[PDB]
Symmetry: C2
Subunit: 32 residues, 2 copies
């Protein structure tokens, strides 16, 4: 549980980096 | 022309970084 929520909080900022630059979190958030 | 193609070759790798991590280049490539 701590591993899945740690990778959730790790790759949440990775998808923040993927979505905020305009012009591993779905499955990880689902398992978490 | 050299400035627009330099920013093309600069931000092409930026959108490579944006698209290869799965789960400024459109307008720059159009002007170039």
């Amino acid at each position: 549980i701590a591993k899945e929520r740690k990778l959730l909080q790790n790759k949440r900022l990775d998808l923040d980096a993927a979505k905020t630059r305009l012009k591993e979190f779905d499955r990880q958030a689902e398992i978490t």
